[PDB]
Every structure is written in structure tokens, then in C-alpha cells.
């Protein structure tokens, strides 16, 4: 959006870069931050932790009714069965999309997001545009921004999550997938489908 008061992106980045490097140098001299610590956190959230983990949970639920029951009863314990858990997902509650109910998750006050199953949130999820509107016009937002038409008779539950509870959407299994392998089913599961802004991929 045009703001005549705002510097160029390049000038903003240049100033942020200098302020961050200066702060970094002080925390390094204090002995509390190191370059290797920075590199480890980046490796974890670029390569080790991401939405492929949540996809494994979804496909197990789709293919194992007993696991699905455990997942809906205690999301943290069920994900631990697969070795999945930890920081920012200590208290997961999974919620099931059905023919009668559609779930969507937001954090209007901050950025709460289930890192162990999804990785770090995409920028749009953290930004004020999505956060302001989804609690007020979820049906219209899903259609206009995500191309996802939820019929008006179908209930939309918006989970505005400011506590350390972490709500994760279990999307419905797409039609046309009877007997597919777990690997094939995982290709249909997206981060967006676990936030509730899109269904799992069709076809």
C-alpha cells in the first residue's frame, strides 16, 4: 500500500542490517550468542522441521482410524508416537474438518503457530491483513484470497489462539484417493490445509 512517508525497501534493509550486526556483536562479546548457535537454528528450521512432518501425521490419521482417535484425543502424545514434537508444539490440539464443519486458525494478537509440525509460519500468517479479517469475515476471506468457497450452510469455526495451546487442522481426505499409498497421499497435504485456509489438494 502506498505510504508517501516510507523509505525505499533497499534503504530500510541497509539500516536494519547494520543495527542487527551491531546488536549481534554485543551479544557475542557478552558470551551469550555465537555464530554456530545462529547456524544451528537456521539449519533446523530450513531443513529439519517443516510441514512434511505434519503431512505424515495427517496421512496416518487418514489411513489408521485408531491413530486418528488418539490424535484427536491428545495431539501432543499422538505426534510423539511418530517422534514429532517440541518447541512451540508442546500442547497440540488437532481439529477435524468434516462435511458439516470447517476449521481455520489465526493468532490475532501475535504469531502463535505449531512449529514442530509446520515449521515457522509464512509471512502472510503473521501480518495484520490476514489476522484482522479472518475473525470477522472468514467465509469471504477464504473465497477472495484463497479461492476456497465454503458453502454458506457449512459452519466455520475460527480458532483465535493466543495461549500456548496450538490448534492444527486435520483436513478431509480428498475424494478419488481410495487405496492410495501413504507417500501418494502426502503429496495432497499442504501447510495451508493444516491452517484451514485451503482444503487438501484435489485430484
Amino acid at each position: 500500500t502506498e505510504n508517501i512517508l516510507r523509505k525505499s525497501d533497499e534503504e530500510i534493509q541497509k539500516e536494519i542490517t547494520a543495527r542487527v550486526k551491531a546488536l549481534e556483536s554485543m551479544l557475542i562479546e557478552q558470551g551469550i550468542l555465537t555464530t554456530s548457535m545462529i547456524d544451528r537454528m537456521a539449519e533446523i528450521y530450513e531443513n529439519e522441521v517443516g510441514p512434511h512432518l505434519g503431512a505424515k501425521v495427517v496421512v496416518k490419521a487418514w489411513t489408521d482410524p485408531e491413530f486418528k482417535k488418539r490424535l484427536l484425543a491428545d495431539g501432543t502424545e499422538a505426534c510423539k508416537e511418530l517422534g514429532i514434537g517440541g518447541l512451540q508444539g508442546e500442547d497440540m490440539m488437532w481439529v477435524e474438518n468434516t462435511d458439516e464443519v470447517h476449521h481455520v486458525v489465526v493468532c490475532t494478537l501475535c504469531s502463535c503457530y505449531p512449529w514442530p509440525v509446520l515449521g515457522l509460519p509464512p509471512n502472510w500468517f503473521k501480518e495484520p491483513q490476514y489476522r484482522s479479517r479472518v475473525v470477522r469475515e472468514p467465509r469471504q476471506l477464504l473465497k477472495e484470497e484463497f479461492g476456497f468457497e465454503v458453502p454458506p450452510s457449512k459452519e466455520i469455526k475460527v480458532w483465535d489462539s493466543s495461549s500456548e495451546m496450538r490448534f492444527v487442522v486435520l483436513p478431509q481426505r480428498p475424494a478419488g484417493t481410495d487405496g492410495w499409498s501413504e507417500e501418494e497421499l502426502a503429496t495432497l497435504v499442504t501447510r495451508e490445509s493444516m491452517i484451514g485456509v485451503e482444503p487438501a489438494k484435489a485430484v
Binding site: 555464530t35 548457535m37 470477522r136
Partner: protein, 228 residues
């Protein structure tokens, strides 16, 4: 607090910007800003609720339009100054140094392995905020409750759009760290936590979808009984 970060129900903020493919970190400074969280947490700058309170004190126009991880930098500096761990004059001198000398090295330092072991333990072991308390929950599924009209200036999790509204308890989760104390330097003071359902019409009037509701997390002091 009642700041501009409390955006639920606000209009006019613009369309969603969703670049069809995006990296986890958009620049090297973002990786640094991200990793400073475990470092400053371990060193006692702030806990999670205090971290959020620091962001809530940003200049509002800066909050609305600056890159997300810049908000993290602001809160590190806020708490560094608060605790006496960051000297502002030294930070300003080092900032000018790196403006003029962007490729100058960082200080020499040991790559202490215990700091990396700390990262691995936090990431895969977690930092649970659940706590045991000595009293049972006051409320239960199906109770009709009303959300407080209190408007504290300090940190809380009381979105303006739910204040004074009536809804139904959906689930009791157990007791957890209370933001209204923890974020203001008053300790964990754990309280039972509930999800409460508020209909779109209760929240937004007749501009409300008759087939939508918001499920909002309420710590026990936030809510009082209407109908058991």
C-alpha cells in the same frame, strides 16, 4: 494493552500479500534475529510473555509496516535496556561502525558447544507452559460465561473484540502460565485455561454470519459464569 497489534476486527489494513513461493529467511539478518531468541532467553533478558510485551510497545506505524523479525530486534533491545544488559550508547556506536564498515568481522569468540546443545534440547524437548495447581477448574464444558471488560495497560491476552462478550465453554485445557502476570514481570501465576466459543453475531452484530463462531482462549480470571 490496547495497542495497534490488537487487530482482530480492524478494517482497512489492505489485501493479503502472499508471494507464491517464499524462503524461510529472506535475508541473512533474519537468521540472526531469529537465533537471538534462545540466546537472550537463556541469558535472562525475557520469557515468552515479556517478549511479546516488548513488541507491543513499538511505534505503531513501524509495527504495521516493518519486517516481522525487526519486531524481534526491538524487543531484544527493550529488554536488554530494562535488565541493564545492553548499553544504548555502545549499541549506537557499534551501529555506526557497521553502517560505515558493513563487511568488518564480528568479534572473536569461542564456539561454546553448550550453547548449541541448549538449542537442540529446546527445539526437540520443548519449553512447556503447563503447570499443576492445587484447585480444580471453576468452569466446565457447556457453561455460559462473559468475558471481562477490564482494559489493563500492561500485557494481557484480552482482544478488544471479545471484551464484554458472552460465549460457551468448549474445553478445559489445564492450568498454564498467565500472560497478565508473566508479561509484566510478576511471575507465572498459573491459571486454568479454557476455549470459549463466541458466535459471529455476538461479536459483530447483524453483520455476522449466522454459521460462524470464534473459539478464543480464556484464562480463568477472564470469565465469569452466566448460566451453568
Amino acid at each position: 494493552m490496547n495497542g495497534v497489534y490488537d487487530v482482530g476486527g480492524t478494517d482497512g489494513l489492505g489485501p493479503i500479500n502472499r508471494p507464491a513461493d517464499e524462503p524461510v529467511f529472506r535475508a541473512e539478518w533474519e537468521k540472526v534475529a531469529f537465533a537471538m531468541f534462545p540466546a537472550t532467553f537463556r541469558a535472562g533478558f525475557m520469557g515468552l510473555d515479556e517478549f511479546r510485551f516488548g513488541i507491543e510497545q513499538m511505534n505503531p506505524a513501524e509495527y504495521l509496516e516493518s519486517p516481522y523479525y525487526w519486531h524481534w530486534i526491538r524487543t531484544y533491545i527493550h529488554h536488554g535496556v530494562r535488565t541493564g544488559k545492553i548499553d544504548l550508547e555502545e549499541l549506537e556506536r557499534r551501529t555506526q561502525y557497521y553502517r560505515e564498515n558493513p563487511d568488518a568481522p564480528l568479534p572473536e569468540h569461542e564456539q561454546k558447544p553448550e550453547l548449541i546443545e541448549f538449542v537442540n534440547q529446546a527445539v526437540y524437548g520443548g519449553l512447556p507452559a503447563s503447570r499443576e495447581v492445587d484447585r480444580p477448574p471453576k468452569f466446565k464444558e457447556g457453561d455460559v460465561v462473559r468475558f471481562s471488560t477490564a482494559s489493563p495497560k500492561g500485557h494481557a491476552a484480552r482482544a478488544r473484540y471479545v471484551r464484554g462478550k458472552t460465549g460457551t465453554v468448549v474445553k478445559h485445557h489445564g492450568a498454564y502460565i498467565y500472560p497478565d502476570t508473566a508479561g509484566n514481570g510478576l511471575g507465572e501465576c498459573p491459571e486454568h485455561l479454557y476455549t470459549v466459543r463466541f458466535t459471529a453475531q455476538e461479536l459483530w452484530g447483524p453483520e455476522g454470519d449466522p454459521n460462524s463462531s470464534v473459539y478464543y482462549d480464556c484464562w480463568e480470571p477472564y470469565i465469569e459464569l452466566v448460566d451453568t
